[PDB]
Design a protein around this nucleic acid. Sequence first.
DNA 1: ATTGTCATGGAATTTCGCA
DNA 2: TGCGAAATTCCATGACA
DNA 3: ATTGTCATGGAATTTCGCA
DNA 4: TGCGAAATTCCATGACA
Lengths: 368, 368, 181, 181
Amino acid sequence: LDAELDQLLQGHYIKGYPKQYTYFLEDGKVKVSRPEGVKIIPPQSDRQKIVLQAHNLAHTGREATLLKIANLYWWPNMRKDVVKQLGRCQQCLITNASNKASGPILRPDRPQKPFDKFFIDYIGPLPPSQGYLYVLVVVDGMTGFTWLYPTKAPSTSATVKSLNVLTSIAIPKVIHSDQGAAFTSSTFAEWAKERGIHLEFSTPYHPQSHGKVERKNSDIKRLLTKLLVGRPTKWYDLLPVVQLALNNTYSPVLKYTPHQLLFGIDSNTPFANQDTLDLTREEELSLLQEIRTSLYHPSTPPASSRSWSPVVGQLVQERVARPASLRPRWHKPSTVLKVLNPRTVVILDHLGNNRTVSIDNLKPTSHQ
Amino acid sequence: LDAELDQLLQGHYIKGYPKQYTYFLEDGKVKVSRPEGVKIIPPQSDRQKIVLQAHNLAHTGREATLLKIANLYWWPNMRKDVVKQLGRCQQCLITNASNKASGPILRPDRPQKPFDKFFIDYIGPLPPSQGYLYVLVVVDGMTGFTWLYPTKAPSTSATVKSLNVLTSIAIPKVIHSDQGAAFTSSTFAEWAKERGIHLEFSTPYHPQSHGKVERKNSDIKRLLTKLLVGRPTKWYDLLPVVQLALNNTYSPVLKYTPHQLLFGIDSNTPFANQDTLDLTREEELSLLQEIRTSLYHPSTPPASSRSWSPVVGQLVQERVARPASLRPRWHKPSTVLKVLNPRTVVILDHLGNNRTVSIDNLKPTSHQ
Amino acid sequence: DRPQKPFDKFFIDYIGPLPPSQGYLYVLVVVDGMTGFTWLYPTKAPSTSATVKSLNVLTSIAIPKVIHSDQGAAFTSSTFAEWAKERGIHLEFSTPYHHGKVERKNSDIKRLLTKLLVGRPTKWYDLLPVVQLALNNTYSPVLKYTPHQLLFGIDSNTPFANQDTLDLTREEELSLLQEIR
Amino acid sequence: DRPQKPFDKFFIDYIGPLPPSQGYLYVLVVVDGMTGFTWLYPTKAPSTSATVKSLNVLTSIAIPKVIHSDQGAAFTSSTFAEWAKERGIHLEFSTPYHHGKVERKNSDIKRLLTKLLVGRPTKWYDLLPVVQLALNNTYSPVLKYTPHQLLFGIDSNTPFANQDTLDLTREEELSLLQEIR
DNA sequence: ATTGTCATGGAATTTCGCA
DNA sequence: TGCGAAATTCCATGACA
DNA sequence: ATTGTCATGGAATTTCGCA
DNA sequence: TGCGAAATTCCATGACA
Ligand SMILES: C[C@@H]1CCO[C@H]2Cn3cc(C(=O)NCc4ccc(F)cc4F)c(=O)c(O)c3C(=O)N12
Ligand SMILES: C[C@@H]1CCO[C@H]2Cn3cc(C(=O)NCc4ccc(F)cc4F)c(=O)c(O)c3C(=O)N12
Ligand SMILES: [Mg+2]
Ligand SMILES: [Mg+2]
Ligand SMILES: [Mg+2]
Ligand SMILES: [Mg+2]
Ligand SMILES: [N+]
Ligand SMILES: [N+]
Ligand SMILES: [Zn+2]
Ligand SMILES: [Zn+2]
């Protein structure tokens, strides 16, 4: 208003307007001679509109917005008004990228026993082989021991069929997976209750959460690729070979094959390890229990220099999963209800549903 | 052969076989009592076959291969024989990932004048807007000043039509682009010769090489997205607005808009900069020439701890561009003929054609 | 002489014909000698082919040094001999027409099967998984451990702590004498 | 009073009817006052619509403070007035029926056009790009610089160092007197 | 027989206003 | 000749098929 | 109302063979 | 009690939709 700017012209002091500068009327506008030139001081009541006009030219951030305004104007604490509008521009908020990295990954404890936790997932679709297009991959958490099932679809039914065959051997406490339609259906839920099996799901669109199986997927494809070099991609008959071959391969860091971690002795496969020939089975299972508990466990890495960790009550935004062309990559702001661990949170989404979500699919909303 | 292993049994010394160890016959096989247990020393003539059998179980690398062999065998310098076979396994060579990073990026000099170099590329396809699906993007190298042309296809013809309109203003020395069909056709080549324009092409599948335009693509899509929030994706009528808006936005690092770098004075657009009001045009163009030459230039970053730089005569492999499912991601080994710069090389491909190729699409072949 | 181990010896046999179930008639029985761990495979016939097909599944998990069987045609065929030689498996036959851990296990299987196929002689295909879990989490009086425990070195998450009757009830003996009618 | 600048004032006019070329008949002429830099736009009619459509292209590169024109209908329509007001452009008209840098430039354009449309009165659409390059890389005797040089502060990569005849030859005067027949 | 780029918004660092 | 606060500059982060 | 993983192959570091 | 060379361990890199 003209209130503030009146005292200024008649040479009195107002907080924020430095006193060593000549303020004058001209063309109907309060002005000021600043080092860079003469700028108009607009009335406080005009400022928001100005910041907005400048911002809206190209929906620019702090500096690019200020540089436009500073061309014609000066007032005290300009960036504060800029940041105020940046924080209220829905369009910028949901479209701009983040420039803060996620905090460092958790390395959760290896499951203590075989059959404590299975990780499962589908690979595919693959070139048709005998009418089959997908592979069900099942990785035992503790041992890494893997089972492979060719399927025609990534369906609950084909999942149930394969697991009936597997669970003939042993029943797991937990089965962990992503939110594929196969694993989240109610038919599959009932199948697990029926057997005292607990279904665990990764936070959505975060395959790191079940990285064990994703990672075994790589080796499965890599060995299949080598075996299929210079031949047609008839992979179905090779699944058995790949399973056996991978289950009996050393992890250089662990010094054991997954077969060894599961059974504590090699079966009749080439280069079987003979070190326990003179022990009894019971002395063997005793050495196995010790071996199992002293396996190398990786430590959580250092944070990157510009990471963010969630705090309860923070405004954060979830990544749009499958964004259409020319549409924002971020949902509208939502509040952190609970910090489950430093990499996982429950948010209230503005509908508002409770969602449990990986920090990797989140950005902290900018400008508070 | 039995030659070497004979002297050994009768207690004489052979280079590589340590003398402090008891070597004996048993079951028809030379053996040895090593700390970890008793291992068979196979005859030198059997070793290659053994290394191969062990490797072929799951086409494993150095350690995982050795751990299998060491289960039954010992001989001198085992890993040397392992590495020898790893280097000869075509399948592993063309399928395995690299674990050496590319050397640090070049930051080549900004073109000295406007119109010295144009970078061009297509965005699309986009949601249909007035029958249009693509955008031709043209970025002036020195200024960043950009021109946008809606097209129906990413064709040579639509390219020629748009550029005829642009080159009405000024003709560039160079036009730089990727190897899209539009830019590599002979119709387009003739169109450039006809005008004394030199066509420059990025090494294949390396959009960093013309990062200026790729990067302007991001801003073009980002502003289009914001403008289209909550409306249908009618982008055609917005191209003009986006062009003008982007050409008149400050780069915070440069402190100038691209319009300013091109013309040295703002046109009648909001928040026009008035600093040169009292200069003559000629004093303005003098300040512009000085401003143009003192623009911030980024320095080449530090190398990552495990990078590789090409050397003439090195075996290297080119990344397969669009690899089919279950097929190797790498071509067969090829030789570096010339190191153009530390990030670019000419290779002889085994056909053998000369190819000029980004180091980012190369891995150094392992095991020499 | 070295102590006995899992994978040392697999004992195979066929059981059937049974009543058709999802089109299957037989059961290939595999018992590991050391652990008494059992694996079952439904087949359509007691043939070399059905045997090879079923053992391929098993031998992609674990390969036995020795397979032991009677002199069934399936097992003495030269096809099956080739199959075994390819995998470095030694074949071993008991003399024609002629007690132990294995022998008792096969008894349990026949008995346990017979018990559960009463009133449902057709639903055995779906019960094979549970038959195996039962068998493999059954306490052995000789050793203090179940086959699960000896194969994996851990307790299981399905202990069958009910040592089940395994005997035919009064209603079921009358059901079996009426099934044959 | 502040020195003259590019974008200070754009001078617009129509030239035509011309012979049809790709279905176009007129040329909207835009000359920047300070630099003499010329822009040309082919149109189908001398209408407010064709003007707005053409100037939208130009005004997405650079917006003039003032547009100067004669009192053509296209330019004095209230549609065109609205268009200009939306962009903060001031409109300016010369009095009806009534020398300078601009005036000479328009002469060159008419003359240069006439020269090149002989023997090819239909191919002018494709020549507009080169007409402009020629005009804009033409040396000005008053200032020591071409319009290119004054707009961009650099030499161009197409200097038309041949100050061209611009006059009609003997074969072409006879061609123009036979074109009207 | 060629080559990454730059808006972005917290944090680090500098400059300003005043004494 | 040094303080508190504002302004400016730094620069990791991500994204352009 | 949950969580990255691990084969790979040069380089760094340790151990071995011998004195 | 220390050398040269081999063996082992370290660990950045990339890849699993
Ligand atoms: C059919 C033509 C011929 C050959 O290549 C294809 C595929 N392609 C791919 C990208 C791309 O991957 N952009 C993402 C990106 C990645 C890294 C980076 F540093 C900068 C970046 F913009 C393009 O931009 C692009 O224009 C093309 C294209 O035109 N083609
Ligand atoms: C339709 C279901 C429901 C939800 O998600 C989609 C998409 N998806 C995506 C990936 C994926 O992006 N893998 C690459 C990867 C990336 C990062 C990392 F650390 C590890 C990785 F393996 C999968 O693996 C996967 O299984 C799925 C899938 O099943 N679905
Ligand atoms: Mg999945
Ligand atoms: Mg997956
Ligand atoms: Mg392209
Ligand atoms: Mg591109
Ligand atoms: N954990
Ligand atoms: N350069
Ligand atoms: Zn905005
Ligand atoms: Zn290999």
